[PDB]
Structure 1
Amino acid sequence: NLRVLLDTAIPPSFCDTVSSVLLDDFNMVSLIRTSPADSLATIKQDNAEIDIAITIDEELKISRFNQCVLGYTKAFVVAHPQHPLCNASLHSIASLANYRQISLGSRSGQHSNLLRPVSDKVLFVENFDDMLRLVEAGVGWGIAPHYFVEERLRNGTLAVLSELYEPGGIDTKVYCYYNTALESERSFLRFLESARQRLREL
């Protein structure tokens, strides 16, 4: 009955708030997980037929889809603890362009201004697991969700560079692209109010 997309930047607990509420208001609900780079691309395929998409990727004026914001989530710039930029007593973002970045997506296929790699030296990866596997190996630095790096930080396995730029992580809007048709449905509005309220708690 309903098909929903959540990118891998949405913390898992939110994928839970979406499930419980939609299943309450609809008969059948389908869930798909994709990288934030592949989120908007997936819903644009005519054969996809995806009704809702919850992602951080920004892109205004999408056919058949309207946009709104559900809340926020945090993301950190991370690098191997012994990475050079960690040891730099003073941290800056202007300098990161000079080091290799482990980013998402592919070279072919445009990246939104949000996920576009900053560095000239870039190494792409399919998911967040592969990014950290290389970053922990000191290959480079990357931008990951809070929940995806919460443990590796607690255990000193990984460092943070974003504390000067935005302490406590870098707030990222969480957009909800909803098929324009759903706008006239009492069930959908009930989903937003609840989904947003639950998302605030974090």
Structure 2
Amino acid sequence: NLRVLLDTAIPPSFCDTVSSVLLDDFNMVSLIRTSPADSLATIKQDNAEIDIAITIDEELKISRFNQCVLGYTKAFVVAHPQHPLCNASLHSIASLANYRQISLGSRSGQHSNLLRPVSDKVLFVENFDDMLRLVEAGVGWGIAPHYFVEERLRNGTLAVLSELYEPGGIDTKVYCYYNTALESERSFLRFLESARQRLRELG
């Protein structure tokens, strides 16, 4: 039995990519979704017995776990089209610190440099859905994966503020944290090679 953790920042496009591949090699495969805020918090619980985690969160070294990079993915800062900062000026991009952020909360109550909120007016949520509800209602700005915001952005229900900070949206690394047990196993290298391909082509 193999247990695999994918945070909700990973497109579910991808979540198909591993399933075919991993099950070529392995017999039981459990897929588990967490908040990116909870990805690393979870694997560190010995009892949770996670073997692989696909997460955007970065941490320098973790016990009993090697890191590597499967690929990259875009994220956008989004707000209500009529949000004060809709004018999207480099002045407005410094002012994020001043307007209310809808940030992802974490059970541990603790956040990495990566996912820690930026503004002091913060309101926490469990998933990117509650995030965008509140953002669609002009209650704040928030930073969400492409696949969540592509729908609403074409629909005009939502606006991007992040395009002068990083044109193209914000590339984020997708990390593979894997139990050291796996490094030698031809099983893993197979999955890794396949995994990288689909996130590439999914770009």
Distance between the aligned counterparts of 2:38 and 2:89, measured in 1?
36
SS class of match (1:109): coil
Q: Specify the alignment match of 1:150 in structure 2.
A: 150
Structure 1 residues 40-70: Cα deviation after superposition (integer angstroms, max 9, x where no partner): 1111112100000000000011001110000
Q: Is the 8 A contact 2:56 2:174 kept in 1?
A: yes
Distance between the aligned counterparts of 2:5 and 2:41, measured in 1?
11
Q: Is the 8 A contact 2:39 2:53 kept in 1?
A: yes
Q: Cα offset for 1:90?
A: 5.2
Where do 5+ consecutive residues of structure 1 fail to align?
none
More deviation, 88-97/162-171: 88-97
Change (3 A) 1:88 1:35: closer
Matched, 1:110 2:110: yes
Q: Cα offset for 1:161?
A: 0.4
Q: Is the 8 A contact 1:135 1:141 kept in 2?
A: yes
Q: Is the 8 A contact 2:65 2:178 kept in 1?
A: yes
Distance between the aligned counterparts of 2:191 and 2:135, measured in 1?
37
SS class of match (2:24): helix
Distance between the aligned counterparts of 2:134 and 2:107, measured in 1?
18
Distance between the aligned counterparts of 1:104 and 1:88, measured in 2?
23
Q: Cα offset for 1:95?
A: 1.1
Change (3 A) 1:175 1:108: closer
Q: TM-score, normalised by structure 1?
A: 0.97
Q: Is the 8 A contact 2:38 2:107 kept in 1?
A: no
Q: Specify the alignment match of 1:98 in structure 2.
A: 98
Size of the aligned set, in residue pairs, is: 202
SS class of match (1:86): helix
Matched, 1:44 2:49: no
The percent identity for this pair of structures is 100
Q: Is the 8 A contact 1:85 1:91 kept in 2?
A: no
Distance between the aligned counterparts of 2:21 and 2:96, measured in 1?
41
Q: Is the 8 A contact 2:76 2:146 kept in 1?
A: yes
Q: Specify the alignment match of 2:27 in structure 1.
A: 27
Q: TM-score, normalised by structure 2?
A: 0.96
SS class of match (1:112): coil
Q: Is the 8 A contact 2:90 2:165 kept in 1?
A: no
Q: Is the 8 A contact 1:92 1:165 kept in 2?
A: no
Structure 1 residues 1-45: Cα deviation after superposition (integer angstroms, max 9, x where no partner): 100000000001100001111011111100100110011111111
Distance between the aligned counterparts of 2:160 and 2:29, measured in 1?
38
Distance between the aligned counterparts of 1:108 and 1:3, measured in 2?
21
Change (3 A) 1:89 1:53: closer
More helix by share: 2
SS class of match (1:167): coil
* Structure 1 outlier segments of 4+, above 6 Å: none
Q: Cα offset for 1:109?
A: 2.3
Q: Cα offset for 1:107?
A: 8.5
Structure 1 residues 69-91: Cα deviation after superposition (integer angstroms, max 9, x where no partner): 00001000000000010035556
Distance between the aligned counterparts of 2:80 and 2:91, measured in 1?
15
